[PDB]
Design a protein around this ligand. Structure first.
Ligand SMILES: [Cl-]
Ligand SMILES: [Cl-]
Length: 461
């Protein structure tokens, strides 16, 4: 009886064992005609779990995993040789990563932690943590866009503002600034605009959990004001990677999996992964979203990745990389999600007890560690990342708008009066029918009464 890697023959052992055990259980139960309401009985369960365990250690099944040998060993050397770059002064830094194919959900290789021998917790598949700002594309902007409430150069308020509970909304030490583009909101990861976006989605009662649940996310309370910043959410790196699989495969989710097939010795098929593809964001949204995340990495505001990788390997650095970082407040978790059109790679770092990493752990160390990781992968499989490009889908609507309001040039009721509105203008990619609408008084997403006049008697004379 033998577990096989994609072609041929440590956390990997356990993790596979366990999925495979689970499946055998479903098959046994069902080959025995064990009834709907019998399998609820605990005792029957324990007999079947134990029976599946046994069928597998002594019955000669051929278990086929999606895992790629060369890749997954390279991801282990890479964490053995370069794991120490994660160590930032706050003790041993733990780490989890998952590589995934964007067309299939197949998981090709992962890193369960620094060293299975010193610490057995699986951080790729079992440690579960808030994702912080990397929630914002899935949950706030890609939805707003996909629902026609925004396009790529719409404006958003980052003026100081408060939670329901009175407290002010921070970004590090900043109480906030002024108005700003989606781009700038994404690249810096400002929290206020994100707050305002999710607030808008509630105001229109959008079916936000219809989106999240279609990628397999489990969030218990959708009404959290910090949700888009990651309050009220917790995920493993593997589930979360599958959320970035969705944005990268033009919005078609494919469910994450490790096992493709289990065959008895004589070919009977005990179990087969059966693709269940689901169109979560329109193609227009996912592609306008690709364009945005291309600049989160190029602009290097919240990660140094494009720099460390250009130096490690200039030609891979020119593949079409997109993604997003996250930092939970207090700095206990750092995330980097990366994608090329072919692959997604999720990475988390943190401490098993939850204390603090250093300020730069996400920004510099995980960024450079991931650059090594992404190198070791390509160096082991030179074509795997691909040389393809993310492209706006033909169905994106290109609209014609003002750098300054994000809406079409037009005239405004400037609180009793009138101005024809101008300055130079910029392309906006929209995922609706029709485009930007004509400018208006409340042009920006979110914003208080006070500030729409701070901003309008300014974005004038
Ligand atoms: Cl670049
Ligand atoms: Cl840099």
């Amino acid at each position: 009886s033998e577990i096989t890697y994609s072609d041929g023959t440590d956390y990997l052992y356990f993790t596979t064992l366990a999925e495979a055990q689970e499946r055998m259980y479903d098959y046994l139960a069902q080959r025995d005609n064990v009834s709907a309401k019998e399998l609820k009985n605990e005792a029957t369960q324990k007999f079947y779990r134990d029976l599946a365990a046994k069928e597998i250690e002594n019955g000669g099944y051929k278990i086929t995993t999606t895992i790629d040998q060369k890749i997954h060993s390279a991801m282990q050397s890479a964490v053995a040789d370069y794991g120490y770059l994660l160590d930032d002064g706050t003790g041993r830094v733990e780490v989890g990563n998952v590589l995934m194919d964007n067309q299939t959900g197949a998981i090709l290789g992962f890193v369960g932690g620094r060293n299975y021998q010193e610490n057995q917790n699986n951080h790729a598949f079992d440690t579960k943590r808030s994702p912080a700002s990397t929630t914002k594309p899935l949950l706030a902007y890609g939805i707003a866009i996909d629902q026609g409430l925004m396009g790529s150069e719409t404006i958003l308020s980052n003026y100081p503002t408060n939670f329901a509970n009175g407290n002010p909304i921070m970004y590090a030490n900043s109480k906030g600034t002024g108005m700003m583009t989606l781009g700038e909101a994404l690249n810096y990861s400002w929290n206020i605009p994100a707050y305002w976006t999710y607030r808008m989605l509630r105001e229109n009662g959008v079916d936000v959990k219809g989106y999240m649940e279609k990628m397999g996310y489990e969030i218990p309370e959708y009404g959290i004001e910090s949700l888009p910043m990651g309050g009220g959410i917790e995920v493993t790196v593997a589930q979360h990677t599958n959320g970035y699989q969705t944005l990268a495969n033009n919005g078609v989710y494919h469910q994450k999996h490790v096992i493709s097939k289990i065959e008895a010795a004589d070919g009977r098929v005990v179990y087969e992964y059966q693709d269940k593809p689901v169109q979560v964001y329109s193609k227009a949204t996912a592609t306008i979203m690709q364009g945005l995340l291309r600049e989160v990495l190029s602009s290097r505001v919240t990660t140094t990745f494009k720099s460390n990788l250009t130096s490690l390997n200039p030609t891979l650095a020119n593949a079409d990389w997109i993604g997003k970082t996250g930092t939970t407040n207090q700095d206990e978790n750092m995330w980097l999600m990366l994608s090329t059109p072919r692959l997604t790679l999720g990475g988390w770092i943190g401490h098993d007890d939850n204390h603090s990493l250093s300020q730069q752990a996400g920004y510099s160390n995980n960024s450079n560690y991931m650059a090594h990781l992404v190198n070791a992968i390509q160096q082991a499989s030179p074509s795997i990342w691909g040389n393809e490009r993310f492209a706006l889908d033909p169905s994106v609507v290109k609209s014609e708008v003002l750098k300054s309001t994000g809406q079409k040039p037009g005239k405004v009721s400037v609180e009793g009066k009138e101005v024809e509105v101008t300055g130079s203008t910029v392309t906006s990619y929209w995922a609706n029918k029709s485009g930007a609408p004509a400018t208006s008084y409340r042009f920006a997403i979110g914003g208080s009464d006070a500030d729409y006049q701070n901003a309008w008697s300014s974005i004038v004379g």
